[PDB]
Amino acid sequence: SRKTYTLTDYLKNTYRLKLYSLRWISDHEYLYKQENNILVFNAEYGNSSVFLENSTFDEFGHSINDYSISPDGQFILLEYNYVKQWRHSYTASYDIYDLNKRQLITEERIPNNTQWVTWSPVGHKLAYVWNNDIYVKIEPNLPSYRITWTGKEDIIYNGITDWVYEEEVFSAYSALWWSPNGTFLAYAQFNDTEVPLIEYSFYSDESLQYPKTVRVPYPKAGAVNPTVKFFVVNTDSLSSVTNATSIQITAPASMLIGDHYLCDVTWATQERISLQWLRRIQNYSVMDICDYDESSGRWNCLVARQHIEMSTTGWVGRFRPSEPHFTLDGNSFYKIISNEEGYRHICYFQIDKKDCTFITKGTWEVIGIEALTSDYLYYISNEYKGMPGGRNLYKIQLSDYTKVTCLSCELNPERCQYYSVSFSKEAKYYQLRCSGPGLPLYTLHSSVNDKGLRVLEDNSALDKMLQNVQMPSKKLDFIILNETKFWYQMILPPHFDKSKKYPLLLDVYAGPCSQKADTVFRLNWATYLASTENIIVASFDGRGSGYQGDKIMHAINRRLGTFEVEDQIEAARQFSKMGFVDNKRIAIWGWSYGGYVTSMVLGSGSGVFKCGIAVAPVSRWEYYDSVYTERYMGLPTPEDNLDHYRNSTVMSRAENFKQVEYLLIHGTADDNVHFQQSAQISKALVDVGVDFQAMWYTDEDHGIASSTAHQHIYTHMSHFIKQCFSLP
Template sequence: RSFQVLFSFLFKGQEYLRQSTDNNIVFYNIETGESYTILSNTTMVSLEILLHSNVSHLPPYKWAYVYQNNIYLKQRPEDPPFQITYNGKENKIFNGIPDWVYEEEMLATKYALWWSPNGKFLAYAEFNDTEIPVIAYSYYGDEQYPRTINIPYPKAGAKNPIVRIFIVDATYPEHVGPREVPVPAMIASSDYYFSWLTWVTDERICLQWLKRIQNVSVLSICDFREDWKTWSCPKFFVSTPVFSYDAISYYKIFSDKNGYKHIHYIKDTVENAIQITSGKWEAINIFRVTQDSLFYSSNEFEGYPGRRNIYRISIGSYPPSKKCITCHLRRKRCQYYTASFSDYAKYYALVCYGPGLPISTLHDGHTDQEIKILEENKELENALKNIQLPKEEIKKLEVDDITLWYKMILPPQFDRSKKYPLLIQVYGGPCSQSVRSVFSISWISYLASKEGIVIALVDGRGTAFQGDKLLYAVYRKLGVYEVEDQITAVR
């Protein structure tokens, strides 16, 4: 059985979109309680990705989806689709969805489509894997014989996918075809990555680019030129922004002078940035900026890097005041949160990932009062009542001025006076984090509960959210300190 985390998109006003337990896509009105199905589970089966426009105050809603690596647009759910791209090809050309390396290592999402705020434009990425070497492996499913899965897989030093960004007029796609957004010259001259895209307004967009060696990051701000129907990118900044209401100044997370990633406010240049948060912890994500508040997540509470809580900080007064929204909600069950906010933060959804069973709730954006439980996983809770799950402990070691956080997954009847076999689950990829306060049932859960094996996970040098000293220790030394730290932790 798997747990459900059921929230996708919050709209303006009182509506939100969710995926029901039977995989239908459903609209729900908070105030009236009315709901209706937009797409049935049978319709969804063959789609790679479905993405709606954000404009809820100007119905009907627009929809974009990817089918067989090509993008289709629907002005209304009942309208026939309009095909945007035609060159999509399995394992060769990916439109609107990332290939393996971008999904796994760069975007960390299954989509590469982005609606402008009012649904006027649709931006998408095209990934060309034509020259990427292919890796093949056997998949053992329900069939009598295994299937062979082929994936374009660039290894270290091999050729990477070629990525291009396009924007299409979603209102008149048949008259104004996709327009390519230029890559910054200082990036285009060598191997590069595209790392994210942010809409500022309907006619201003920001794209983040990165050199392959990952020592230079460029943010391009591009404006739509109505006369030429093109996108011009005259300015370049280094950052990942969340723009304020003036569409010029913005907030971003980057390292402060002490080597911890915090929120800064930039009005003109990065050199003149005003630091908003500070401390020996890290800000993780900025969710929403309104006229008077900024909502973000961090691992500040009680000093555990593997936890996440949601905070509100006032930006309309000085000095700014800070409130933790989630620190004292269901404390035993919930220590790792993410959130989704409607426009103007009138409502927000909280998703708790653990360490207890995940639960999703809807809240009033002004009072923080819980309005509705969206999903509390009662079915899974009942199914697990007679199952002995392993116990988990999260602790830390201090070794040679380095803090190593570790998680122990222990058999249900663990006795400290007895000896047990120990298995180390090793993963220390750059910017990763294994020691987190999240609920999970996996192969190592089985080994601990059924076979009586103690499992250990260690976040060593190179892992994230504990400051730059630990994070960048492995720069140009991959595979050295990671091994040393795993061995040190076991000893």
């Protein structure tokens, strides 16, 4: 060891982390990308053949961004002319290749600027969204049937989400839900008519003489929200001569009383769909279960079959109510909910019965239900060794809940403590992905006896490269505050000597249900800072953090900018009493919510921190969107929570920034946390006479993610941190 991990190493990607990304096409087979080829693999034996040759489209004319192949395997969708919108949304051009015939389809094509495309879950049908309307193609070469006729840019969204629903509710652009066998197409309709618009400048290339104004319907805290309708259409009875009939399912009586959200769509059977609705005051949700009536041609949701989920101490769900996992007959389901002790566990419900029974228990949490069979439910949790930041796959025997097996705990306990899973179509095989503390490990197993078939990727090419680099280590541990554990992690410089005093950087996020202390191996900015600059990079999960029960998570209910801020400062006080930290050189940085907390910490007047960087920070809660903000804060009204909205601004703390060195950074085309947020911080610092450092990034959004911008921001921050710490 003598080379360190450099800023260039991080920025130019010298040391690459190998993945093994598959998509199960069946229960037996999966698709992989070899050396630009598309390979098909046999799960059983590991043999492969070329499913699609690299050069098949070298006369396509267009650069292909993605492929999507139909469930029956007869057709493939080629996606090109990719244009990013928000976090999930984009537009693209699409071509359909006939696999059997080996030919591009030239007639009745998917138009340009298509917003969303999806194959039916079986067969080869298509639903697409274009100019905010839904279209369906039974056959890839036949005409499309126009489902909806009301789509209007920035106003009516059919089968696609609007800004807030995309970002905060569904984490997707899509709002189309096919029934399991493709008969029914379910969809949501959003109406943004009175949602105010966020406006900002877009400068574009220098050839653009006059800046453009981007206008986006975006509800900020307490503003008028989008309204939602829900429909189902029968695709097995579409007409070429008459318009399609869409049957509306109306929200429950309990939701229609005021503003509400559609928060979940899950198909139970071929003729049964579950819908969860959330009140605008996000402590009351309702699951409706709706059946198709063959004689009516309609959908009825019995009031007797509703399921209420609520919270006394907070909002419902981690970020939203959890999704149901129905048994094959759709008469019962499993769902994560917080128990009596405020820990999130799997409850078993009967469609008819208000009471569920908990099938897991304890002072740990189920992260997600991964797969359900007739015999087993498969889930991820942080149970192993009481470490909320570890992740393992368990299987619970359905006929007796005390038979729980850990399927990943013991495989490589040293290098592997953080797992996610990908099961085949009918859970016959599963791929395990371990993300640390060692280099990521990808393995294939059969569900039959949970035997390991093979290692898919071991990252040995990376391991050999790392040998000669002076790499940092990671300590993950806990401190005790008021008789409660709070977990922290430290990225420690190479040859860490306890007798030395190192500068410390506190890497903060600290948003509700966050987790910044975990067993994951990462190569990032912090890796460079520890390896090259000998800075300790620390993270702490205090009050408000997730995966440790409601008492911790709900600690910040209605009170953002309080306990989660105070706990970062207290953690730094604790780190400085650990002996190896130079009290004179403690810094803090964060992005977005992290930017908010950083700013709040630096404006606290605590004296702990010399300097800090806030990137794309929230500055006050009325500036941020309604569904995220109101979840934690309620409404900004005298009759609700206005006083805390007013009291939790970074602007209010300006005067205390005289004690610290601040860098403020923001993208000018941030649609998420608007540039407005930084512009108000800087104005307030100016108004009280504090000097600080700033950087706007022209035309960059929340990610600040352009190759050049990405390199530029990290270079700028490194110089700042190095100057703060007196590092040449």
